[PDB]
Amino acid sequence: MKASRLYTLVLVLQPQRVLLGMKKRAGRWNGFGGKVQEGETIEDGARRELQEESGLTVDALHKVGQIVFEFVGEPELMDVHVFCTDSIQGTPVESDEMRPCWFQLDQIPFKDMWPDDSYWFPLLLQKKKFHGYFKFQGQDTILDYTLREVDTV
Ligand code: NA
Numbered sequence: 001m002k003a004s005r006l007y008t009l010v011l012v013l014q015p016q017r018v019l020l021g022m023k024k025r026a027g028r029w030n031g032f033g034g035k036v037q038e039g040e041t042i043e044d045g046a047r048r049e050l051q052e053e054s055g056l057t058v059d060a061l062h063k064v065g066q067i068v069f070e071f072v073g074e075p076e077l078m079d080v081h082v083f084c085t086d087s088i089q090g091t092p093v094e095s096d097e098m099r100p101c102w103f104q105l106d107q108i109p110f111k112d113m114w115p116d117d118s119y120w121f122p123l124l125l126q127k128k129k130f131h132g133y134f135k136f137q138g139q140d141t142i143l144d145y146t147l148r149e150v151d152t153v
């Protein structure tokens with residue numbers, strides 16, 4: 001089994017809208033996140049990446065899922081820990097890396113999101129917790145995947 005590298009993903013989910021970020025350099029909407037750094041907890045890495053990529057500062061995040069990504073031709077798995085909060089207290093800010101944008105929950109921009117999001121994002125919206133795994137050939141094609149609802153992440 002391949003080694004895996006720790007990443008975070010953060011979804012700001014309010015009752016009628018969700019915050020996504022357009023990857024500027026790319027072209028898909030995503031939650032905010034990045035690699036976990038040495039010595040920080042996964043949740044603290046998620047808070048840090050939310051601040052760096054979206055400008056939002058939050059004190060706490062709720063873990064809602066974990067997704068492992070395998071890319072054909074790449075040696076490592078991406079082990080993505082997915083977090084969610086409903087509670088913010090500042091405005092998102094656009095950088096040269098991510099442009100944050102709100103979407104109503106009947107307008108989730110799946111056509112411009114990664115293909116795996118079609119499977120797990122509905123579980124997140126239902127307040128279900130999940131474990132997923134997706135194998136990709138390139139950016140567009142899923143060759144294999146698993147997804148399970150769990151009671152504990
Ligand atoms: Na990132």
Ligand code: NA
Pocket residue numbers: 110111112113114115118
């Ligand atoms: Na899509």
Ligand code: NA
Pocket residue numbers: 114115116117
């Ligand atoms: Na994704």
